[PDB]
Amino acid sequence: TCPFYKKIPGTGFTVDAFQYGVVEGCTAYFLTHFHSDHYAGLSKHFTFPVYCSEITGNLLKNKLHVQEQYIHPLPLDTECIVNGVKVVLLDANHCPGAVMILFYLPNGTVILHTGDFRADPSMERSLLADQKVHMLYLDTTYCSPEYTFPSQQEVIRFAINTAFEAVTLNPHALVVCGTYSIGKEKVFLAIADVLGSKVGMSQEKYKTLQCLNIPEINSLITTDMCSSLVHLLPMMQINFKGLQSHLKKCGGKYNQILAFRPTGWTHSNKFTRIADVIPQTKGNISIYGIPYSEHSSYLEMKRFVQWLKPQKIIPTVNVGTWKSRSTMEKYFREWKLEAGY
Ligand X SMILES: CC(CO)(CO)NC(=O)Nc1ccccc1
The item of ligand X, Ni ion, none sharing an interface with residue 35, based on CB under 5 to 8 Å by kind, is: Ni ion
34-41 contacts: CB < 8 A, separation 24 or more?
Answer: 34/59, 34/60, 34/63, 34/95, 34/97, 34/182, 35/95, 35/116, 35/181, 35/182, 35/183, 36/181, 38/115, 38/116, 39/64
| Residue 332 engages ligand X in binding (rule: CB under 6 A) | yes
Identity of the residue, 5 or 240, whose beta carbon is nearer to ligand X in the bound complex:
5
Q: Among 31-39, 99-107, 197-205, 309-317, which window interacts with ligand X (CB under 6 A)?
A: 309-317
Looking at beta carbons only, is 118 or 261 nearer to Ni ion?
A: 118
Nearer to Ni ion, 85 or 136 (CB): 136
Is there a contact between 151 and 159 (Cβ–Cβ < 8 Å)? no
Span of 80-88, 101-109, 110-118, 312-320 interacting with ligand X by CB under 6 A: 312-320
Quick one: 116 or 185, whose CB is closer to Ni ion?
Answer: 116
Q: Rounded distance, CA 269 to CA 150, Å?
A: 9
Stretch that binds ligand X, among 34-42, 214-222, 232-240, 329-337 (CB under 6 A): 329-337
312 touches ligand X by CB under 6 A: yes
Nearest C-alpha neighbor of 151 from the set 36, 297, 16, 35:
297
If one asks whether residue 133 binds ligand X (CB under 6 A), the answer comes out as: no
Q: Which helix (H) or strand (E) holds 300?
A: helix 298-308
Cβ atoms 78, 54 nearer than 8 A:
no
Nearer to ligand X, 18 or 137 (CB): 137
Q: Which member of 16, 116, 139, 300 binds Ni ion (CB under 5 A)?
A: 116
| Cα–Cα distance for residue pair 207/78, rounded to 1 Å | 29
139 binds, among Ni ion, ligand X, none (CB under 5 to 8 A by kind): none
Give the DSSP H or E segment for 93: none
Q: What is the 3-state secondary structure (H, E, C) of 149-201?
A: CCCHHHHHHHHHHHHHHHHHHCCCEEEEEEECCCCCHHHHHHHHHHHCCCEEC
Tell me the CA distances in angstroms from 282 to 231, 241, 286, 326, one per residue in order: 19, 10, 7, 43
Residue 263's nearest CA partner among 295, 303, 220 is: 295
Nearest-approach distance from CB 309 to Ni ion, in angstroms: 26
Q: Which secondary-structure segment (H or E) carries 295?
A: none
By CB under 6 A, name the one of 160, 314, 324, 327 that touches ligand X: 314
Residue 336 interacts, among Ni ion, ligand X, none and using kind-specific CB cut-offs from 5 to 8 Å, with ligand X
In angstroms, what CA-CA distances link 14 with 52, 80, 106? 12, 17, 16
**Contacts with Ni ion in 15-44 (CB under 5 A)?**
35
**Chain CA centroid to CA 46, Å:** 24
Of the pair 37, 165, the CB lying nearest Ni ion is at 37
Which of 318, 323, 338, 307 minimizes the C-alpha distance to 132? 307
Taking the complex as a whole, the smallest distance from the CB of residue 38 to ligand X amounts, in Å, to 20
Residue with Cβ nearer ligand X (200 or 310):
310
Please, what is the minimum distance in Å from the beta carbon of residue 7 to ligand X?
Answer: 14
Give least dist CB 98 to ligand X, A.
23
- Asked if 247 interacts with ligand X (CB under 6 A), we say no
Q: Does 300 bind Ni ion (CB under 5 A)?
A: no
Nearer to ligand X, 110 or 166 (CB): 110
Q: Choose, by CB under 6 A, the member of 7, 72, 207, 336 that binds ligand X.
A: 336
Chain residues binding Ni ion by CB under 5 A are 35, 116
